[PDB]
Scaffold this motif. Sequence first.
Motif, short mmCIF file in Angstrom:
data_model
loop_
_atom_site.label_atom_id
_atom_site.label_comp_id
_atom_site.label_asym_id
_atom_site.label_seq_id
_atom_site.Cartn_x
_atom_site.Cartn_y
_atom_site.Cartn_z
N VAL A 166 -42.16 -68.43 -1.46
CA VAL A 166 -43.56 -68.40 -1.02
C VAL A 166 -43.75 -67.50 0.21
O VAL A 166 -44.89 -67.22 0.59
N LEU A 167 -42.66 -67.11 0.88
CA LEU A 167 -42.75 -66.29 2.08
C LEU A 167 -43.19 -64.85 1.83
O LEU A 167 -43.98 -64.30 2.59
N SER A 168 -42.63 -64.22 0.80
CA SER A 168 -42.94 -62.82 0.54
C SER A 168 -42.70 -62.51 -0.93
O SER A 168 -41.79 -63.09 -1.54
N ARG A 169 -43.46 -61.56 -1.49
CA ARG A 169 -43.24 -61.10 -2.87
C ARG A 169 -42.05 -60.15 -2.89
O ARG A 169 -41.54 -59.83 -3.96
N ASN A 170 -41.62 -59.67 -1.71
CA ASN A 170 -40.47 -58.78 -1.57
C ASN A 170 -39.20 -59.65 -1.63
O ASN A 170 -38.89 -60.37 -0.67
N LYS A 171 -38.51 -59.63 -2.78
CA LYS A 171 -37.32 -60.44 -3.05
C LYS A 171 -36.17 -60.16 -2.10
O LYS A 171 -35.45 -61.09 -1.75
N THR A 172 -36.02 -58.90 -1.66
CA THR A 172 -34.99 -58.47 -0.70
C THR A 172 -35.22 -59.19 0.63
O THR A 172 -34.27 -59.72 1.21
N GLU A 173 -36.49 -59.25 1.08
CA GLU A 173 -36.87 -59.92 2.32
C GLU A 173 -36.68 -61.44 2.26
O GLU A 173 -36.29 -62.04 3.25
N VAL A 174 -36.87 -62.05 1.07
CA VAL A 174 -36.60 -63.48 0.87
C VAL A 174 -35.08 -63.69 1.00
O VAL A 174 -34.64 -64.63 1.65
N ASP A 175 -34.27 -62.78 0.43
CA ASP A 175 -32.82 -62.84 0.51
C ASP A 175 -32.30 -62.65 1.95
O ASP A 175 -31.38 -63.36 2.34
N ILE A 176 -32.91 -61.74 2.74
CA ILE A 176 -32.56 -61.49 4.15
C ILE A 176 -32.85 -62.75 4.96
O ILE A 176 -32.00 -63.20 5.74
N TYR A 177 -34.03 -63.36 4.71
CA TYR A 177 -34.46 -64.61 5.34
C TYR A 177 -33.46 -65.73 5.06
O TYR A 177 -33.11 -66.48 5.97
N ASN A 178 -33.04 -65.87 3.79
CA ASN A 178 -32.12 -66.92 3.36
C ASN A 178 -30.70 -66.78 3.86
O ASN A 178 -29.96 -67.75 3.79
N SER A 179 -30.30 -65.60 4.36
CA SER A 179 -28.93 -65.41 4.82
C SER A 179 -28.82 -65.11 6.32
O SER A 179 -27.74 -64.76 6.80
N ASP A 180 -29.91 -65.27 7.06
CA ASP A 180 -29.89 -65.03 8.50
C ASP A 180 -29.43 -66.32 9.17
O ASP A 180 -30.13 -67.34 9.06
N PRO A 181 -28.25 -66.30 9.86
CA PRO A 181 -27.77 -67.53 10.50
C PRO A 181 -28.61 -68.00 11.69
O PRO A 181 -28.47 -69.13 12.10
N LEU A 182 -29.50 -67.15 12.22
CA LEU A 182 -30.36 -67.54 13.35
C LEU A 182 -31.67 -68.21 12.90
O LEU A 182 -32.45 -68.65 13.72
N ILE A 183 -31.89 -68.27 11.59
CA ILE A 183 -33.07 -68.91 11.01
C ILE A 183 -32.76 -70.35 10.66
O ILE A 183 -31.77 -70.60 10.00
N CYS A 184 -33.63 -71.30 11.06
CA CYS A 184 -33.44 -72.67 10.64
C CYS A 184 -34.30 -72.86 9.38
O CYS A 184 -35.52 -72.69 9.41
N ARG A 185 -33.62 -73.09 8.24
CA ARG A 185 -34.22 -73.26 6.91
C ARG A 185 -34.23 -74.74 6.52
O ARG A 185 -34.73 -75.08 5.45
#
Length: 280
Positions: A166-185
């Motif tokens: 739901v964050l972005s239609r850009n799949k690469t950016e969803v993947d970057i978001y999902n693998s950033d260790p500084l992001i709390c998911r």
Amino acid sequence: DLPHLVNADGQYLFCRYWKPTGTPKALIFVSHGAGEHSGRYEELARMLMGLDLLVFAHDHVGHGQSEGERMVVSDFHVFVRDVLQHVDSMQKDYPGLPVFLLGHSMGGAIAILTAAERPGHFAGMVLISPLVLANPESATTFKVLAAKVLNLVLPNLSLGPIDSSVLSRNKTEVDIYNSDPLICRAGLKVCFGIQLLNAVSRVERALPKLTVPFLLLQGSADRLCDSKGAYLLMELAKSQDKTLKIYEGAYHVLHKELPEVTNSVFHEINMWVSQRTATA
Ligand SMILES: *C(=O)N1CC(c2nc(-c3ccccc3)no2)C1
């Protein structure tokens, strides 16, 4: 070791600076959203620095490289207080320079509340899908009571994580978001959900006194910050200089959306800040 600041609670906040080659024309504080951090504004900050703006940011308490329990806050005002501390320090070193705010999501709610606390102080505000509205069920007296009851026994109970798609239609950016260790998911904690409810309630009361010039960027298919909240901000803010741009079918993270949207977002911020920096 790293650029930092010590807040009023004695907590270390990780700081980030993008200083132009020559003398800066203006200052701009970047305010990130819930669960993310300042490192996600690298490209936007390089573009702003190219306009001769001194870009500065810090990771909010409980986020990124800053101290504190992850996505927890004693009161939402802590975020606003810490932004003002950082702004006041920068203005001491660069007196007479205009100061702008740029906020995304929760960072946008923080920017609004920062400007509302100091009327006539900020030259302008850039809002990317700001947090201004509470969800339908979420804010009823029953639901507020239930969450407050829950908070007393299980404050760290997770509401459940969201679908990152739901964050972005850009799949690469969803993947970057999902693998950033500084992001709390991790799912939103009950105690933090109550603080986001405080934020929205405080934003609503602040709008009749909000006079700061602003650019508002909003995706029509945003499932986190509903587009109707952007229309209500345009209507209820008292600002004499307010612009809204709607991105048809775009999701929440507009500055990390499909290239056509992201390029437009960057260009619009560039033009808007540039026109109000020449004004200085
Ligand atoms: C931007 O940083 N935010 C996080 C996302 C959001 N807001 C909420 C919420 C929950 C309860 C009451 C108000 C707001 N959940 O996720 C937008």
